[PDB]
Design a protein around this ligand. Structure first.
Ligand SMILES: OC[C@H]1O[C@H](OCC#Cc2ccc(-c3ccccc3)cc2)[C@@H](O)[C@@H](O)[C@@H]1O
Length: 158
């Protein structure tokens, strides 16, 4: 089991950490959501699906910088909503193919009432999302840590 972003940035068998740069809607209105959809950038696969089934959760999610200060949010994992920062571990998603499939995580972030102007700065750390992988074969229990950075500024009008 291993993961990557499609520009080639990989986290190999056994886990590790990687950085992900996300394009963000440059204008987000109060009352509406900034959607940081990591399922369009983070992909994973099972290396031996004929023998082993892999199980993948969102173990931990938290916000940083302007996301932490200027937005409040939830995280959707595999079709369901959870508080952000996360509390419980999510249900597992099964990975059973050598063909990469997305890690189905997205943040839904709405500006706080006092937000206005440049609310997220280009280059800043905005989130850390941790994927936990286990399987039905042995005791492997690996963390894939995704450090999420803003590729661009986000402005909240007014
Ligand atoms: O994505 C599948 C697995 O890939 C990595 O482990 C590599 C392996 C293996 C493997 C395959 C077959 C056997 C095997 C042993 C005895 C008899 C038959 C098959 C043992 C280990 C590692 O990332 C595991 O955590 C993950 O579940």
């Amino acid at each position: 089991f291993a993961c990557k972003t499609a520009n080639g940035t990989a986290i190999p068998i056994g886990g590790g950490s990687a950085n992900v740069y996300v394009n963000l809607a440059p204008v987000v209105n109060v009352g509406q959501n900034l959607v940081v959809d990591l399922s369009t950038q983070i992909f994973c696969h099972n290396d031996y699906p004929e023998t082993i089934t892999d199980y993948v959760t969102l173990q931990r999610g938290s916000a940083y910088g302007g996301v932490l200060s200027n937005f409040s949010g939830t995280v959707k994992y595999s079709g369901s909503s959870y508080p952000f920062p996360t509390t419980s571990e999510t249900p597992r998603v099964v990975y059973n193919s050598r063909t990469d499939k997305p890690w189905p995580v997205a943040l839904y972030l709405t500006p706080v009432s006092s937000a206005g102007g440049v609310a997220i700065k280009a280059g800043s750390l905005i989130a850390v999302l941790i994927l936990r992988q286990t399987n039905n074969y042995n005791s492997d229990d690996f963390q894939f840590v995704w450090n999420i950075y803003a590729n661009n500024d986000v402005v909240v009008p007014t």
